[PDB]
């Protein structure tokens, strides 16, 4: 007798494993729909005896599987799982060296922006509400980051090799972060329209676009008003474990002890390369696999991260 059937497990979350008896005369596709083995699309291949007892990813095809997928990924986007697997097939071959005490990514497939994201996340006090992200994030911190990178790609709607952006990626990722108690209060004054207090929460409480300087947001920054004038606003109150300050790329000085980490961007509207700036015993520039220690830094910066707990203004009235 030749082996005609094998037992395997199918899953959408790598946690709930569903026993299957597989017919070796049919493709995985014919039995399960689109099917993946460690990210590789095996929809078109027939089973092998060596597949016995292995775990295969499938698409959610009934209410139970859809529920398991939503519970794990916190999205109902039907294309997500396939995009995640497509990315994973490539990110499993990336290398994740320890550089300046953090898990970085050797350069591959235009992944500089993702390396800068990964490096930043390891320094923020953040957690993810989506179990897929939180579990992968834990493993990434230790050097096992292939899965986390594939997820970031999928959550970002980026494919492997696609040119990316740190701020855009952070916007997508932070939608799944623990930011429900993040709060920002801004005092806004227009000379024509008058005064108002704006309260922002969640992602909008921690991301700002217009200045790299947390000090400037505290003391006053120009902001367009609906009337066509430039109004001024400053930070009254901040409750979050960090803030991310962004601005169109320009030369900026970074001083150890005055920020947590940052993204350098060498380039312009067309093209650019993203490197990570942090500090340990001195300033560190981490460009994939490559470290440069620095005693000072003035360079082209687009995003600066700062630690926070709770801040209240000392500006009166
Ligand atoms: Na995961
Ligand atoms: Na901010
Ligand atoms: Na202030
Ligand atoms: Na960064
Ligand atoms: Na990097
Ligand atoms: Zn106005």
Swiss-Prot record:
Its cofactor is Zn(2+). It is a multi-pass membrane protein. Zn(2+) 4 binds at residues 190, 193, 225, 227. Residues 72-315 form the Peptidase C16 domain. The hydrophobic region HD1 probably mediates the membrane association of the replication complex. Responsible for the cleavages located at the N-terminus of the replicase polyprotein. In addition, PL-PRO possesses a deubiquitinating/deISGylating activity and processes both 'Lys-48'- and 'Lys-63'-linked polyubiquitin chains from cellular substrates. Plays a role in host membrane rearrangement that leads to creation of cytoplasmic double-membrane vesicles (DMV) necessary for viral replication. Nsp3, nsp4 and nsp6 together are sufficient to form DMV. This is Papain-like protease nsp3.
């Amino acid at each position: 007798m030749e082996v005609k059937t094998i037992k395997v497990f199918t899953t959408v979350d790598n946690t709930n494993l569903h026993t299957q008896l597989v017919d070796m005369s049919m493709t995985y596709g014919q039995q399960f729909g689109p099917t993946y083995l460690d990210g590789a699309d095996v929809t078109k291949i027939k089973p092998h005896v060596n597949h016995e007892g292995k775990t295969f990813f499938v698409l959610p095809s009934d209410d139970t599987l859809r529920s398991e997928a939503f519970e794990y990924y916190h999205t109902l986007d039907e294309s997500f799982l396939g995009r995640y697997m497509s990315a994973l097939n490539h990110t499993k071959k990336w290398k994740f060296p320890q550089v300046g005490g953090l898990t970085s990514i050797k350069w591959a497939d235009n992944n500089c922006y993702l390396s800068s994201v990964l490096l930043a996340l390891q320094q923020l006090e953040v957690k993810f509400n989506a179990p897929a992200l939180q579990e992968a994030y834990y493993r990434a911190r230790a050097g096992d980051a292939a899965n986390f990178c594939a997820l970031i790609l999928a959550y970002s709607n980026k494919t492997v090799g696609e040119l990316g952006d740190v701020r855009e990626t952070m916007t997508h990722l932070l939608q799944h972060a623990n930011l429900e108690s993040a709060k920002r209060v801004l005092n806004v004054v227009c000379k024509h329209c008058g005064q108002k207090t704006t309260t922002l929460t969640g992602v909008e409480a921690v991301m700002y676009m217009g200045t790299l300087s947390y000090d400037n947001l505290k003391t006053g920054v120009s902001i367009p008003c609906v009337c066509g004038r430039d109004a001024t606003q400053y930070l009254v109150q901040q409750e979050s474990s960090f803030v991310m300050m962004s601005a169109p790329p320009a030369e900026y000085k970074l001083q150890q002890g005055t920020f947590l980490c940052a993204n350098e961007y060498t380039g312009n509207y067309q093209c650019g390369h993203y490197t990570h700036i942090t500090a340990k015993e001195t300033l560190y520039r981490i460009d994939g696999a490559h470290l440069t220690k620095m005693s000072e830094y003035k360079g082209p910066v687009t995003d600066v991260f700062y630690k926070e707990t709770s801040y209240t203004t000392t500006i009166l009235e």
